Amino acid sequence: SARKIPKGVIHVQASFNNTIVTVTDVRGRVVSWASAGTCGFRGTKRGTPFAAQTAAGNAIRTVVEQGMQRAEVMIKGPGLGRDAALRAIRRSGILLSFVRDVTPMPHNGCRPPKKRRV
């Protein structure tokens, strides 16, 4: 089990080739995580909006032991996995308070690597 409080943050690591749908409490002990590599298929298929939908659905379908009402989602990063994930959470329709972005916006910190030339 857990603390049994039905409010908790959801983080969506939407990568450029993957998604991770994790869900955790206010302190930060994770109650479940499920990614595109978690839900079966793996390779070039993972990181597509069907993987965001299935990974989000298989992520938050297992919080029915909690039955969280007051949801709040804190996504991160670029990729094709955001909008399908928000349509998945709104499909489950639980009390999504506010979604938000927490993406790392650097202030010219490190040099990003070589351009691809492909």
Binding site: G77, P78, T103, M105, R111, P112, K114, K115, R116
Partner: peptide
């Protein structure tokens, strides 16, 4: 926009 992150994947040029 998140287009400041597709901007910052490739190199400082």
């Amino acid at each position: 926009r998140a287009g400041v992150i597709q901007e910052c994947k490739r190199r400082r040029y």
